EvdO1 (Micromonospora carbonacea), 598 residues
Amino acid sequence: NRIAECDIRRTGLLPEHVTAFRRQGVLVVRGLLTPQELADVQEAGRALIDRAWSTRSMEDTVWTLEPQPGAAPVRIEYVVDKARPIAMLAGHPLLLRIMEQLVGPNLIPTWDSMVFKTAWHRDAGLYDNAVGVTGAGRVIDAGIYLDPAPEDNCVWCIPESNYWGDDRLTATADQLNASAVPAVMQPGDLLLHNILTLHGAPVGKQRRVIYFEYRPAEVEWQLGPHSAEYIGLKQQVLRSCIQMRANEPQFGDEEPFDYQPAESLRHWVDRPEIDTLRFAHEEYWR
Amino acid sequence: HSSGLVPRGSHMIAECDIRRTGLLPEHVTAFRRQGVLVVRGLLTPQELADVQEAGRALIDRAWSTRSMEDTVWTLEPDQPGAAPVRIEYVVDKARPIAMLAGHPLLLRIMEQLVGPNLIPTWDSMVFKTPAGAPRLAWHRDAGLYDNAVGVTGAGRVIDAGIYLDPAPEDNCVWCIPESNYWGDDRLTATADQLNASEWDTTGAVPAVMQPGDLLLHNILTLHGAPAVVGKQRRVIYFEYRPAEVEWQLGPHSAEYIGLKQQVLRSCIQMRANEPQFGDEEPFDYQPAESLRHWVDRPEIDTLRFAHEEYWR
Ligand code: NI
Ligand code: NI
């Protein structure tokens, strides 16, 4: 059974899309980025990877082997704090109007990164009774694609596996890894998946995806995985990116996302106006 | 020769107008954030009347019998002035209410709010004693969940209150918007202060209702009502929860889920085969496959499944 598709600039996010996402754990969104923004983010992506090779450092960068013959960077962490177009991407109103419907009005940006890879699994940050807490799709990985992902080389999902118990999840994944539907993507498209959805990929050309994860503040507040202070800082981060993007004249015609969480969840005055967009998870863990 | 003469004289709180707009993104937002949503005009006039008369019938029954079976009474029924205030399992007791429980606008809204694996849980009618009803103290409805706000502050466990009688501002429900996200300390403190004090509506909003209107509230939203007189104020309440939440956190046994799914499908079907509702686009109930359980047990012969018999 196919992965539902939202042509976002054509229809908006329809109830059917929302329902598809909640049931199957995944949703394909076509044409998120305009031609111009796609190129801007492609370029920021290009420069960040180049700088990783030249500056063979592991600062916020995952390497296959130590910068050893055949070593390569495959991931940069906190890319929103590293490139101006990506920070502005983090405040994209179509993306965030979607995240608001799916995660709720108390959404906060958690992980942000860019993966450029050269196993079936769920993503991390699991809770006790994870399916009880977020089988419905409240903790969401936003994959914004800079390069094509053809059926040869794309992520595969097992729909509805976001409601699977631990035992069946583990048993099925072990079978699958020892020995499904594809998200076939064009640049500027967005893949949304529930972190509880079993996904994975099987000999191809380098691909780039920017990942934004989102959680409800009230889930973080009570269950983690971050510390309580973290909520307010990522709220400033979200508000800053929306601000930055709003003040950019190529985006002047966009109606900015109106971030309005419940009163008791507004925590951005709590701290002084932040210096950085980078907040290391290990420094804000519980 | 005949003259052939012709005879003389002769000649030869946000509001959703569900049937007007549909359920909009702003409506879902407002419900998620404030813990409350008014839906105007849920019922046709004809269905409202059918449901009003089923309500009267049930109330009349409670008085006739003074049974404590499925009925909450102010005092023991043998006592002077004792009255009934709530009847349980009204969906089993009255065919127009079972069909109401399959109402496609209601369920499509619930599906957007509670999710695709929604199941119906509590079903009842509440009404007060028009000679005078005591104050409804500020309270949350029972969730039974640890970390309740983490689990459903966003509004996944929901009371749908369908109004048979008007609830004007001088006789209606009040609630504190966004109190569905309050931690236990704030909620407990705030509720205690309000209840030890005289009735006071500041920081609260009223739920002002015409008959056939629908009040959606998050069970974590603090609510209450002032002492009132002169109106019977009947409300039919359907609660809904997600199947995967019940499955893992309760409060019901795992078996309950499949049975209530059967109840839901049964109600949807008889509403479909009802001539009065043929023009309706019937609700298409489609939960995730690993949570379809409505074949796990033999065909249900009833719509009533007593909570204490399916508790975990
Ligand atoms: Ni992953
Ligand atoms: Ni109540």
